[PDB]
Amino acid sequence: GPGTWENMAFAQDSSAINNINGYLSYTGWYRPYGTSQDGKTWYPTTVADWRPILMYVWPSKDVQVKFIQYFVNHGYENSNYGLTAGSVKDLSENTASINLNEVAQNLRYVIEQHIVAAKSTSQLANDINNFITTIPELSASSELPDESGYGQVIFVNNDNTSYADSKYRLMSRTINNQTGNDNSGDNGYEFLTGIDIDNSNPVVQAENLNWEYFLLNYGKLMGYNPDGNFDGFRIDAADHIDADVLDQMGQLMDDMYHMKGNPQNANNHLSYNEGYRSSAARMLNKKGNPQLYMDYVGSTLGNVLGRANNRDTISNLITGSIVNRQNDVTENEATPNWSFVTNHDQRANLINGLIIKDHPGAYKAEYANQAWQEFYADQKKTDKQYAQYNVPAQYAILLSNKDTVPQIYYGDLYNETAQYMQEKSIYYDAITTLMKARKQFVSGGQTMTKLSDNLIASVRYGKGVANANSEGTDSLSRTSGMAVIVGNNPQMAEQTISINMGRAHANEQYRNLLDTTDNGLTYNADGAENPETLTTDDNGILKVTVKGYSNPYVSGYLGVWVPVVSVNQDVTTNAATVSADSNKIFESNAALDSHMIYQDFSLYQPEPISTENHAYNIIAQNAELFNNLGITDFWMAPPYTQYSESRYNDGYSVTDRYNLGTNANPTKYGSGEELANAIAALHSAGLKAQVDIVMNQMIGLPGQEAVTVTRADNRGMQTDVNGKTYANQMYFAYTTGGGNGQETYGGKYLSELQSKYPDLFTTRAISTGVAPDPTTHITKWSAKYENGTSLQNIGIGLAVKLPNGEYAYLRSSDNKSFNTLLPSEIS
């Protein structure tokens, strides 16, 4: 026998009603006790007969009304049940509740018809989704994107989502705001993108140590190649995570390798933080430099040399860095830093931006093949529109620059979208040439001198020659040093210059290492304005001829001079095993300057086709190459398992922090077996490997949680996006995951870490006043360990509220707190 009592759910548990943490969604599906198509015969449902909630329950009558009209005007009209555009067009929130429901019940008969006709609940589901977008309060737009399509919410405490409550979530505790005592200042904000991890929670801080220890012992712990272990870190988003963790990493690295005393041990376990805010240098300096500061000089370099229009004066290569090189003749004073011409984020900014120019802010279909073709094309032209001008000159500056650990971009040596290392860039010959010159000649003090608003001479005086007047200590002193002349005006008048090479280089012969020509660069003097060898006068002054050139390699002038020698030479300074200062980890000096970093990836690095093309395998094959190039320290891509749907599959979208790929399931870069082998190939050639460690976010966690949220600016303070705002809302965010990796390995090394190094777990963190807590392992990430998430494209009106004001609820399984309460139309 039949009746409408059967719209009732078959059971008020999770087996028949969709719920997240006990709560219901208007996008949710449930199993009624029965359905009907005509009104007369009602059929019991099978456990496979599931129907969307938005057919039976609505946020308000206004919405019930729009659900009815939308469905009718989209294929679900039937006049034999009184449903045509004509029968629904006058209905409104003012209509009798008793009438509207009869109309809704009749629509439901028609929906059952379409399901029968189509033999599936697909077009229904696709219609529910399309319907929802029409409704302001129910749509993704209710979560209030900003005008650029960006935004974040914060996770807060709430009586309904109390399992997601935290005592911590200290936000934007970065840099000089580790104590939360200058929120208004120069810190660096909490939220980038993704599900933001609360690195202020003591338990999280313990998990970060666990992680770091696994990574520093990767090959061993995983039973892969046992010499396949990382030596250090590149810290992603370091300005955007509670600075406690940077303290804590420092401490682990000091405990494990004894770095404070020994520059040799410090220098063999290099770490560098991504983050250029000058406040960051201050912080690092005040802390004794546990990591290397990221210097801003690449930005200067692109601004002075790289632009087509609007080029900043040449003097800025002198002062536009955390190090002033007007005349830098001292050691252990500079902030220990790493610098570059290009990084992964600059190259992406440019390719995106080309994407929106070539397609009017449109649907982002993958015409990034189009942007990349345009880049390669502009790259080769003299009169470039986008791509950096003067790329050889920028590396000339960087590789001659004292008091930095320079970082080379894979993409500046190779065509980054072709298969890994398959295609050398046009800039390969220049750069590699300058890299090899560095090992052989670049040492001693530095003087950068203006000779025009557009011309500069950067001279290094050679190993063991501290400044212009020094005689020379080292036996390489005489035959080392370098002049790098850079002009940034292609119209510069032909002219003679003088370059003071220092008193250590009176009456000395100088090879034309690299000079500009009509077509580009010559490596042997052919076609330049200067001969292959020149000699200094009795005062050590070099006379050189320079002019403006304009071709794909140079828009300005570039020339490099190094001493003539008969032999290979290496001016690298070994570090001693007791430091000029016991308060310091890293020190900016000859030893640290002898290091050189290589970024071994690009975000637009293509998926490997075969196993032979795994970057890890190709890296293990060319270890000696990097070594030959004077590279000492290999920055490797985040090797973690990624979100399936990610744009670039590049490493920053982390889904498992411990799964670095297996034989059948590699990252873009390869399997973890293969990772270990590359690492050990590098070691075998005397190089060191650092891992990109991503403590800031995870992206693609599959498990939804009901959490309570407040539309917030990117510092975790509530914001008032175009008039509107919202606080204390229920939100069904994706917050939970980790992979088997987080489960197998999460917290596993903490007892070993406590036994060997107890100070880690007694040292009170600055932001919390409380030491990392190793007594709870994290085997799965969830909201309780997260500050919030970037906007997730779901909307804020999904949570079902009963007419009386309370959210609908189910005592389900783990969900057993309060008393069950379902809508009228489901019981």
Ligand X SMILES: OC[C@H]1O[C@H](O[C@H]2[C@H](O)[C@@H](O)[C@@H](O[C@H]3[C@H](O)[C@@H](O)[C@@H](O[C@H]4[C@H](O)[C@@H](O)[C@@H](O[C@H]5[C@H](O)[C@@H](O)[C@@H](O[C@H]6[C@H](O)[C@@H](O)[C@@H](O)O[C@@H]6CO)O[C@@H]5CO)O[C@@H]4CO)O[C@@H]3CO)O[C@@H]2CO)[C@H](O)[C@@H](O)[C@@H]1O
Judged by the rule CB under 6 A, the positions of this chain that interact with ligand X are: 607-608, 610-611, 614, 641-642, 644, 649, 664-668
CB 561, min distance to ligand X, A: 45
Comparison of 336 and 638: residue with beta carbon closer to ligand X: 638
Comparison of 63 and 615: residue with beta carbon closer to ligand X: 615
CB 643, min distance to Na ion, A: 18
By CB under 5 A, the residues from 691 to 750 that bind Na ion are 696
Count of residues interacting with Na ion (CB under 5 A) = 5
> How far does Cα 738 stand from its chain's mean position?
18
Comparison of 239 and 650: residue with beta carbon closer to Na ion: 239
Q: Could you tell me which of 811, 680, 724, 600 has the C-alpha nearest to residue 146?
A: 724
Q: Which stretch binds Na ion (CB under 5 A): 196-204, 215-223, 579-587, 652-660?
A: 196-204
Q: By beta-carbon distance, which residue lies closest to Na ion?
A: 240
Task: Please give the helix or strand (H or E) that residue 496 lies within, else none.
Answer: strand 495-500
CB 157, min distance to Na ion, A: 19
Q: Could you tell me which of 512, 511, 499 has the C-alpha nearest to residue 540?
A: 499
Residue 642 partner contact from Na ion, ligand X, none using kind-dependent CB cut-offs of 5 to 8 Å: ligand X
Is the CB of residue 743 less than 8 Å from the CB of residue 777? no
Tokens of 807: 């959210």
CB 354, min distance to ligand X, A: 24
Q: How far is CA 661 from CA 213, 233, 640, in A?
A: 18, 19, 7
The site string for Na ion over 45-84 (x = CB under 5 A, - otherwise) reads ----------------------------------------
> Hey, what amino acid is at 708?
T
CB 677, min distance to ligand X, A: 15
Q: Could you tell me which of 76, 86, 150, 166 has the C-alpha nearest to residue 113?
A: 76
Residue 644 partner contact from ligand X, Na ion, none using kind-dependent CB cut-offs of 5 to 8 Å: ligand X
Residue 159 partner contact from ligand X, Na ion, none using kind-dependent CB cut-offs of 5 to 8 Å: none
Longest C-alpha distance within the chain, in Å?
Answer: 114
Residue 240 partner contact from ligand X, Na ion, none using kind-dependent CB cut-offs of 5 to 8 Å: Na ion
Q: Are strands 233-235 and 271-273 parallel, antiparallel or unpaired?
A: parallel
> How far does Cα 401 stand from its chain's mean position?
27
CB 504, min distance to ligand X, A: 53
Return the residue of 240, 269, 460, 595 that touches Na ion, per CB under 5 A.
240
Comparison of 194 and 559: residue with beta carbon closer to Na ion: 194
Comparison of 507 and 663: residue with beta carbon closer to ligand X: 663
| Sequence-ordered alpha helix ranges (H) in 119-243 | 122-134, 202-216, 218-221
d(CA 635, CA 270): 10
Residue 624: other Cβ atoms inside 10 A: 14
Residue 747 partner contact from Na ion, ligand X, none using kind-dependent CB cut-offs of 5 to 8 Å: none
Residue 27 partner contact from ligand X, Na ion, none using kind-dependent CB cut-offs of 5 to 8 Å: none
Comparison of 479 and 790: residue with beta carbon closer to Na ion: 790
| Sequence-ordered alpha helix ranges (H) in 72-168 | 85-88, 97-118, 122-134
By CB under 5 A, the residues from 373 to 392 that bind Na ion are none
Is the CB of residue 240 less than 8 Å from the CB of residue 190? yes
> How far does Cα 787 stand from its chain's mean position?
18
Residue 664 partner contact from Na ion, ligand X, none using kind-dependent CB cut-offs of 5 to 8 Å: ligand X
Return the residue of 127, 196, 247, 295 that touches Na ion, per CB under 5 A.
196
Residue 534: other Cβ atoms inside 10 A: 18
Residue 196 partner contact from Na ion, ligand X, none using kind-dependent CB cut-offs of 5 to 8 Å: Na ion
CB 130, min distance to ligand X, A: 26
d(CA 641, CA 668): 9
Comparison of 240 and 711: residue with beta carbon closer to Na ion: 240
Comparison of 160 and 419: residue with beta carbon closer to ligand X: 419
CB 240, min distance to Na ion, A: 4
CB 647, min distance to ligand X, A: 12
Distant-in-sequence, close-in-space partners of 470: CB < 8 Å, separation ≥ 6: 444, 445, 461, 464, 502, 503, 504
Helix (H, G, I), strand (E, B) or coil at 106: helix
Q: Which stretch binds Na ion (CB under 5 A): 239-247, 581-589, 594-602, 732-740?
A: 239-247
> Is residue 274 within the footprint of Na ion (CB under 5 A)?
no
Tokens of 248: 């804590």
Distant-in-sequence, close-in-space partners of 446: CB < 8 Å, separation ≥ 6: 325, 327, 328, 329, 400, 401, 402, 458, 459, 460, 461
Say what angle helices 61-71 and 97-118 make with each other, to 10 degrees: 40
> Is residue 231 within the footprint of Na ion (CB under 5 A)?
no
Comparison of 34 and 651: residue with beta carbon closer to Na ion: 651
Is the CB of residue 552 less than 8 Å from the CB of residue 478? no
Tokens of 158: 């709430």
CB 699, min distance to Na ion, A: 13
Comparison of 204 and 314: residue with beta carbon closer to Na ion: 204
Comparison of 206 and 396: residue with beta carbon closer to Na ion: 206
CB 658, min distance to ligand X, A: 14
Residue 666 partner contact from ligand X, Na ion, none using kind-dependent CB cut-offs of 5 to 8 Å: ligand X
Comparison of 185 and 686: residue with beta carbon closer to Na ion: 185
CB 254, min distance to ligand X, A: 35
Residue 190 partner contact from Na ion, ligand X, none using kind-dependent CB cut-offs of 5 to 8 Å: Na ion
d(CA 17, CA 317): 65
Residue 696 partner contact from Na ion, ligand X, none using kind-dependent CB cut-offs of 5 to 8 Å: Na ion
Residue 147 partner contact from Na ion, ligand X, none using kind-dependent CB cut-offs of 5 to 8 Å: none
> Is residue 674 within the footprint of Na ion (CB under 5 A)?
no
Q: Could you tell me which of 498, 503, 431, 434 has the C-alpha nearest to residue 462?
A: 503
d(CA 675, CA 690): 12
d(CA 769, CA 697): 24
Q: Could you tell me which of 619, 663, 665, 673 has the C-alpha nearest to residue 641?
A: 665
Residue 608 partner contact from ligand X, Na ion, none using kind-dependent CB cut-offs of 5 to 8 Å: ligand X
Tokens of 202: 């003591």
CB 696, min distance to Na ion, A: 5
Q: How far is CA 433 from CA 355, 389, 407, 420, 565, in A?
A: 34, 19, 15, 21, 16
Tokens of 584: 């310091």
Comparison of 539 and 644: residue with beta carbon closer to ligand X: 644
Q: Could you tell me which of 633, 628, 618, 629 has the C-alpha nearest to residue 675?
A: 618
Comparison of 155 and 652: residue with beta carbon closer to ligand X: 652
344-382 exposure pattern, b = at least 16 Cβ within 10 A, e = fewer: bebbbebbeebbeeeeeeeeeeeebeebbebbbebbeee
For 722-733, give the DSSP string: TS----SEEEEE
> Is residue 190 within the footprint of Na ion (CB under 5 A)?
yes
Comparison of 154 and 281: residue with beta carbon closer to Na ion: 154
Residue 683 partner contact from Na ion, ligand X, none using kind-dependent CB cut-offs of 5 to 8 Å: none
Tokens of 754: 């406590």
Comparison of 177 and 696: residue with beta carbon closer to Na ion: 696
Paired residues of 51 in beta bridges: 30
Comparison of 365 and 664: residue with beta carbon closer to ligand X: 664
Residue 668 partner contact from Na ion, ligand X, none using kind-dependent CB cut-offs of 5 to 8 Å: ligand X
Q: Which stretch binds Na ion (CB under 5 A): 26-34, 45-53, 234-242, 262-270?
A: 234-242
* Interface with Na ion (CB under 5 A): 190, 196, 240-241, 696
